[PDB]
């Protein structure tokens, strides 16, 4: 029996020493096995594999513990889906555009580029070590791992069409939003006032208007009495908010928002570009940049910086 | 109890539901009646995203509430 020595891992930190038989596939020995993202399950060890690190599926208690602590998921399919995505995302290009890590277009990835571009402008931290480590690398321009993780956490595959708002929602479940807090009032001329408090991801997301000012001044919403009521923001504590709405023509003006994305197309297929407010507005389409003093188009998500906001609106007399 | 679901096009869907029903179950009722596949449907209540595995009760959706049906975007 001839062997080579390799290391297996689920977290790239804890490495497990292995001796593998050259006459058996990696699948016969570890099960699903990946070398820099590439699926090597069906092949036999090569002399050139000596001393290399391989990713494996968590197949014992130690590996399962390490995977859980690193990824913050109990989903047995996770590593396999992560590696499957990584084999493609490692081939993507991550140019710096307007000082931000972007993604050159490939594999229907414009929604992912808009997610990545927006995150870099938010004061946000991830809890899962896998995301912390990969996000740091992504900020540094090395974003393949982070992109593959976005796909794995979102239960999406490379090439699948996607929604920035939905993807952001998945990612933010793993962000530290423990102190994010939103208080909303709803006032009806007949029914009076009702108040609710939202925390975590729900405190920083909204679907119905792009305008943070509108949420502050009043959004018309149906009341159970059959009349219209007014919903408004009483208090917000978070480092940002994301305001979303079905795509519609909207004007982005300098000095009024952090960043945004627009969706051009229809409900069957569209394409995203990102707009960031710098010394002027920058529209970022993958590797491409267009500078402009304002942007009018089918905006669907707008991000705003926040610290603490308290309303000036008083209860009705 | 009756609830209402306002679509993007401006139609109001009228449903008979119970507080215990899951959001997934509400989507199933929408599908049979309007032919909208549940995987495309995204239900919103006063700006808040509703999730499939949770229930109307979880969101304090009571009688005569109106939800909004928006659609998942399909960006390349
Ligand atoms: Na984009
Ligand atoms: Zn009322």
**End position of a domain, from candidates A180, A204, A237:** A180
Coil vs helix vs strand at A14: coil
Please list the residues that pair with A3 across neighbouring strands. A21
Ligand that comes closest to the CA of residue A191: 2
Please list the residues that pair with B12 across neighbouring strands. B6
Find out whether A215 and A244 touch, Cβ atoms under 8 Å.
no
Radius of gyration of chain B (CA): 11
Please tell me whether residues A106 and A124 are part of one structural domain: yes
Hey, what domains does chain B have and what are their CATH numbers?
Answer: 1-76 (3.10.20.90)
Find out whether A140 and A99 touch, Cβ atoms under 8 Å.
no
Find out whether A308 and A236 touch, Cβ atoms under 8 Å.
yes
Closest chain B C-alpha to A248 CA, distance in angstroms: 12
CATH of residue A310: 2.60.120.1680
For tokens 């794995």, name the residue. A152
In angstroms, the CA B2 to CA A121 distance is 43
In angstroms, the CA A115 to CA A290 distance is 19
Please tell me whether residues A133 and A65 are part of one structural domain: yes
**End position of a domain, from candidates A132, A150, A180:** A180
- Alpha helices per DSSP H over A218-263: none
In angstroms, the CA A120 to CA A135 distance is 9
* Cα separation values, B5 from A117, A279, A288, B69, B75, Å: 34, 43, 40, 6, 25
Q: Which residue of B lies nearest to A286 if distances are taken between CA atoms?
A: B76
Please tell me whether residues A35 and A139 are part of one structural domain: no
Subunit contact B47:A231, Cβ cutoff 8 A: yes
In angstroms, the CA A6 to CA A15 distance is 9
User: End-to-end CA distance of chain B, in Å?
Assistant: 40
Residue of A157, A145, A146, A142 lying closest to A93 (CA atoms): A142
Please tell me whether residues A185 and A317 are part of one structural domain: yes
Q: DSSP string of A76-101? A: TTHHHHHHHHHHHHTTS---EETTEE
Q: Which domain holds residue A163?
A: 57-180
Tokens linked to A145? 């791992």
Closest chain A C-alpha to B38 CA, distance in angstroms: 14
Find out whether B8 and A300 touch, Cβ atoms under 8 Å.
no
Q: What is the side-by-side strand order in the sheet with A270-277? A: A205-207, A240-253, A294-305, A259-265, A270-277, A281-285, A288-292
Please tell me whether residues A31 and A92 are part of one structural domain: no
Resolution in A: 1.4
CA A221 to chain centre: 29
CA A192–ligand 2 middle distance (angstroms)? 7
For tokens 């009228």, name the residue. B14
Closest partner CB to B49 (pick from A169, A184, A226):
A169
In angstroms, the CA A303 to CA A118 distance is 8
Please tell me whether residues A116 and A243 are part of one structural domain: no
Please tell me whether residues A32 and A95 are part of one structural domain: no
Tokens linked to A303? 């991000």
Q: What angle do CA B24, B27, B30 make, to 5 degrees?
A: 160
In angstroms, the CA A93 to CA A104 distance is 5
Q: DSSP string of A29-86? A: HTSSEEETTEE-TTS---GGGTT-EEEE---SHHHHHHHHHHH----TTHHHHHHHHH
Q: At CB < 8 Å, which residues of chain A contact B?
A: 108-111, 114, 161-166, 169, 184, 186, 196, 198, 202, 205-209, 215, 219, 221-222, 224-226, 231, 246-247, 263, 265, 267-272, 300
| A212 phi and psi angles, rounded to 5 deg | -65, -40
Closest chain B C-alpha to A163 CA, distance in angstroms: 5
How many domains would you assign to chain A?
Answer: 3
CA A26 to chain centre: 33
Please tell me whether residues A219 and A144 are part of one structural domain: no
Find out whether A250 and A296 touch, Cβ atoms under 8 Å.
yes
Please tell me whether residues A112 and A19 are part of one structural domain: no
Find out whether A198 and A149 touch, Cβ atoms under 8 Å.
no
Q: Which residues of A touch B44 (CB under 8 A)?
A: 207-208
**With a CB-CB cutoff of 8 Å, which residues 9-68 of chain B face chain A?**
40, 42, 44, 46-49, 60, 62-66, 68
Tokens linked to A178? 């423990």
H or E segment and range at residue A222: strand A219-222
């Amino acid at each position: 029996v001839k062997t080579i020595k390799v290391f297996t891992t689920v977290d790239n930190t804890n490495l497990h020493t292995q001796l593998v038989d050259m006459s058996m596939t990696y699948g016969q020995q570890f099960g699903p096995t990946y070398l820099d993202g590439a699926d090597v399950t069906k092949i036999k060890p090569h002399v050139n594999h000596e001393g290399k690190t391989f990713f494996v599926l968590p197949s014992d208690d130690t590996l399962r513990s390490e995977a859980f602590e690193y990824y913050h998921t109990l989903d047995e399919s996770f590593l396999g889906r992560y590696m499957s995505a990584l084999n493609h995302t490692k081939k993507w290009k991550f140019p710096q555009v307007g000082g931000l890590t972007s993604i050159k277009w490939a594999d229907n990835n414009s929604y992912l580029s808009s997610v990545l571009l927006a995150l870099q402008q938010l004061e946000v931290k991830f809890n899962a070590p896998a995301l912390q480590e990969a996000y740091y690398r992504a900020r540094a321009g090395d974003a393949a791992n982070f992109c593959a993780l976005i796909l794995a956490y979102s239960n999406k595959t490379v090439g699948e069409l996607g929604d920035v708002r939905e993807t952001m929602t998945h990612l933010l479940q793993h962000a530290n939003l423990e102190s994010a807090k939103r208080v909303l009032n709803v006032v009806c001329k007949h029914c009076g006032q009702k108040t609710t408090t939202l925390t975590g991801v729900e405190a920083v997301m909204y679907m119905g208007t792009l305008s943070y000012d509108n949420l502050k001044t009043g959004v018309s919403i149906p009341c159970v009495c059959g009349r219209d009521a007014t919903q408004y923001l009483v208090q917000q504590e978070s480092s940002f908010v994301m305001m979303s709405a079905p795509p519609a023509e909207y004007k982005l003006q300098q000095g009024t928002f952090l960043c945004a994305n627009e969706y051009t197309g229809n409900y069957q297929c569209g394409h995203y570009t990102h707009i960031t407010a710098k010394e002027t507005l920058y529209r970022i389409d993958g590797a491409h940049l267009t500078k402009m003093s304002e942007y009018k188009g089918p905006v669907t998500d707008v991000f705003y910086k926040e610290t603490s906001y308290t309303t000036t609106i008083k209860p009705v007399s | 109890m009756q609830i209402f679901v306002k679509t993007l096009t401006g139609k109001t869907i009228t449903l008979e539901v119970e507080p215990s029903d899951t959001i997934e179950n509400v989507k199933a009722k929408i599908q049979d009646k309007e032919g909208i596949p549940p995987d495309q449907q995204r239900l919103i209540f006063a700006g808040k995203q509703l999730e499939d595995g949770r229930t109307l009760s979880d969101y304090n959706i009571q009688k005569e509430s109106t939800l909004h049906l928006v659609l998942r975007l399909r960006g390349g």
